[model samples]
Target: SKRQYADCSEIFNDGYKLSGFYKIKPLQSPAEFSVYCDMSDGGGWTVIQRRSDGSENFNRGWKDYENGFGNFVQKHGEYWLGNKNLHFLTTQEDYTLKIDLADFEKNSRYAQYKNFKVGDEKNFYELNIGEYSGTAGDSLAGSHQRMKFSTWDRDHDNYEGNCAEEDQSGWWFNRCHSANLNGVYYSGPYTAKTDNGIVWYTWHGWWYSLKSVVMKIRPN
Candidate 1:
């Protein structure tokens, strides 16, 4: 069976953990936090998790998570990490969070396959990048195609039954399905991205991220 894949907007790199670019540390009140971008700043930032308590601490204390531990904990409480400007929620109702550096290593299966793969590719697809460019019926048709693509790409035989590969090859549905799962788990904060800034037409999977398929190439 094809294991479901998670997604995110930012894809951390090798020096991510130490470089303080990504993290998974929890917060003080056990709320939820997410990453955000400030288009005006020409950089990246994070949004504090929504706390049912409605405390003022929601956006503040981001510095704590950064200075604290470095790990991605979904459904987190009052904890934070990364720059004082960014952090992720460790506890919430339905959000699944994964830090590229910390969470990826923790996933045994993902690590195994990703590590063993050959060749290299990096692309990030943002599902909700802009206005969905489909009409009522067209959108429906697009969704149907996505469903098939998500269901292990049964509609096509391009991949050897690999959901990961199907997603990488610009199969919109493959990515959309995953994105759907992410939305279910993480509320509306479900955003997937490839490492090198690649956008796609439809959101095939939820909570997805961009990665390099090949780590090393054979020397001839």
Candidate 2:
């Protein structure tokens, strides 16, 4: 039990609130990691935020809601919020978001949408939350579990024709759209070559290419 806990910690960090210590760049393909916790902590979903100390308006505080955290893009492009884990493919275009399997099988708020198939992997599966908005507020009673958005990493330098009005970011919460879209999505795959890729909108916006997912785990 202690060995497994160390296994997870060795890959990521052994802290409840992780800072700039374990960011995996070039996202290891088929990469998989786990969050640490105790049995008393009980398995459940927890919110995660990724922020940096660069410039472009930092320090939005914890649970800032709109701009603080939980889900929202910042100008400096250093922060984001998410509930589940994302698995990116080598192609980088097609990826999968794996929500907690225990939560899904045990009746989570967003359980109805867990239609995707799962691999033989332990404790996780692909997330298929059905069609949802990428920028609207929380969805129906059982669907306030969609991914939120922030500003694009790059600008019209690539999708010059279809870009947000310079610096005008949008907001979204749950499954607010009718289209068959995942919570947070990317219209195009991200590449160092293009200024496009990460997109977000008020109703049905798309977002970034997933690098990998951070699965949560607990000690026996």
Candidate 3:
């Protein structure tokens, strides 16, 4: 048991949190917005303040709503917020916000997507609670035991991890502990070019990718 715990510590080192310090200004009037994508801690979905002059302020407190990260471009780019890059729309050309994934680096805590498949090998799928991985891919990968945003068994133990299902592992999860989604809600299923041919998962155990170059949002 001790050895497994140590092994987990070796791979997963950091916790989920904002990744950078970008610039953003608030809108003249605050507008409630929703993200159609998942913005986990890696500073991908940062909050900003849009200004009349087009300047912005990157909200210092970024990890406010992470448990609700999603999978789409819900809000308009005319007024967006993020760390170090308060991206905004200068013109109404329907500019899709440029996504710099450098912030969601592997093994650095901030990663919240989990990749897995049935019967192992090649049936990779990104997992989210209440969402099915099978529907996301033709491979028919599956996921079970979704976790409630605010539910866990606290046994006064050190920060090890919360297992989605308790088995011989002793009711402990060595994955990325609790997801610090920072209030955004949906988080996961991010892909990369190098990710192909490799079943790479974050050290903390939050995300799993099939290593595909062309990132596609396979909604459940």
Candidate 4:
């Protein structure tokens, strides 16, 4: 018999210990603070684990979990390991263990915004740059910026599970997906450059489902 995965959704609060594997506590430096998981579902942790934007922190992807702490700098901000079903797994039992808020190396680059409101801001487009050339900051400001857009529950969307491959595009549900820009037309899982801060292209919008977006930003 296999050990079924337990639902550890509400395990990020301070004073909440994870089977004594690790103790959750408040940060000591830079004013004591508390950190929590952003989402309460599988898609929240596994799929969008990587920082879509070019950044040195929180850029680790789901596939990197096999290596324990793959490419994760753990400076500051939210973090996740795997999907809700399988969660984090590793050959080393210690590496496969849970992570506490105090686990990350001390980082003081946190920023605060005053009353940031949604639906009131003009020209707001969620940019999900997958993996493109150029440094984190450079790629973001530069011309070549990779992006992805997938519906939360449209698993049957086109692109055939190859949405991660470059130059692809299609509908995606519950998982991350993208479309490509074919000159004046657009396809799934593609790259686009901005001119005068504007992108114009055509796309085949077939699948339509009502959904909401969860945006996470690290102001480093």
Q: Per-residue CA lDDT of candidate 3, range 36-113, in tens?
A: 222342223332221121122211122311111222232322233221111111111111122112113332211122
The superposed Cα distance between candidate 1 and the true structure at residue 153, in angstroms, equals 14
lDDT of 1 by residue, 1-220 (tens): 5321111213222112211123222333233233321112112222222121111121212123233332233332322232222211212112322111111223211111111111111111111111222211112223122122212322332334544333332222342332211111222224444311111113222233322110110101
Cα deviation in Å at residue 28, candidate 3? 28
lDDT of 2: 0.26
lDDT of each residue in 57-145, candidate 4, tens digit only: 22223233212221233333222322211111111111111111110123111111211111100211123222222111111222223
Worst 10 residues of 2 by lDDT: 101-110
Estimate the TM-score of every prediction.
Answer: 0.19, 0.24, 0.20, 0.24
What TM-score, to 2 decimals, does candidate 4 have?
A: 0.24
Off by over 4 Å in 2: 1-42, 49-85, 88-128, 131-220
User: Rank by TM-score, descending?
Assistant: 4, 2, 3, 1
Computed on alpha carbons, the lDDT of every model, listed in order, comes to 0.23, 0.26, 0.22, 0.22
Candidate 3 vs candidate 4: the TM-score winner is: 4
Candidate 2 on 90-116: residue-level lDDT in tens? 122222222221111222111122222
Error of 1 at 84 (Å): 23
